Ligand binder design. Sequence first.
Ligand code: HEM
Ligand code: EJV
Ligand code: CL
Length: 393
Amino acid sequence: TIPHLAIDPFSLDFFDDPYPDQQTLRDAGPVVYLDKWNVYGVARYAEVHAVLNDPTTFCSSRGVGLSDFKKEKPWRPPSLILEADPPAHTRPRAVLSKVLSPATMKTIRDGFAAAADAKVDELLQRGCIDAIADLAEAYPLSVFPDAMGLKQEGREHLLPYAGLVFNAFGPPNELRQTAIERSAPHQAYVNEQCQRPNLAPGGFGACIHAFTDTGEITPDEAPLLVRSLLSAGLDTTVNGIGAAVYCLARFPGELQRLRSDPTLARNAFEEAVRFESPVQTFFRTTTREVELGGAVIGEGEKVLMFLGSANRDPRRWSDPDLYDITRKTSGHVGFGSGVHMCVGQLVARLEGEVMLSALARKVAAIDIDGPVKRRFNNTLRGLESLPVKLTPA
Ligand code: HEM
Ligand SMILES: CCCCCCCc1ccc(C(=O)O)cc1
Ligand SMILES: [Cl-]
């Protein structure tokens, strides 16, 4: 009954252009079986949304990558939040939710905004820049490590460690194998910065450690929760901002709308997250036999959810393949959905908004003026290089 497909969603050809294969996956049926990796697949909005919102049946504690922690050893100690289920999930989720709170956003917003204006002003002096290294990477690097309370030395380890994390969710292909074999120095740096003495007062990391006395987490849980922010908190935003700039570069009419109303900045970033879905895919593991989209899935099966595909499903979206900065984006799954829905989304949206605000106010045009290169990663979608000429307003 369930269609079997030979599509490899973790192959370079798929990364290079996923959209036709995603339509093939959607149109084959609500649930598919991927013979390449022996996992179930769901690529339509309805089923992706359903799976995300049933954490009891589709659990995370057996891992959200291909590997089933009940069968294999996780490559690093499990995340206490991403790779945990309720109830163990709940209090660590609460702590990170308060660390990354509206009040915290209120404290850092003006610095985040100044840094974005300054970056755009600096890039306009150069004119011809690489929007990945010089903007999508440089801006988050200029605010997030400091907000974490990290020291200066060793920050070069952060993006490699994140690339490693996101590749390690994937199957054991060459991307994953190579990342792991290169991992040791990046892991060592990150794990050491997670210790209380190494996190500057006032920052996210220190605030996690300060929350170890409330009965929500214990002091021995705080380093791995800092580890979560150092895993998730930089590279995601890099590819998110990268996405938004690429969208503005490819859809000049939308840049023109954004210039005319800079208050559209926050939604213009949200749409870019829908449209490019920086985090493309991840897994759940079934804890029981379950009926999903008319198909029966046994206990202990991995299920692969295509977030980027759900975000382009014409069953849910009008003109999904158009970038529309005034779209009602509410309900997209680029940040997940349900109990694990991105706990860092206020930081993400803050960085995204103030960068696109700076662009809206200072830039007249964004023209690609060189070869675009894609970056391949088992989990993340984004570019290696985006040469653009910026014209000042
Ligand atoms: C555009 C940027 C981002 C995107 C697209 C993104 C995407 C996601 C998605 C899809 C999930 C759900 C994973 C799941 O359900 O298994 C998630 C969870 C999470 N994200 Fe984000 N994220 C972004 C930025 C950030 C930032 C800036 C931080 C930290 C400062 C962060 C930290 C986390 C953490 C700790 C979780 C686990 C939450 C939980 O399991 O309850 N993310 N993210
Ligand atoms: C790729 C499938 C999982 C979704 C990834 C979201 C980003 C993220 C990474 C790592 C951690 C962590 O807790 O370590 C938390 C979130
Ligand atoms: Cl690690």
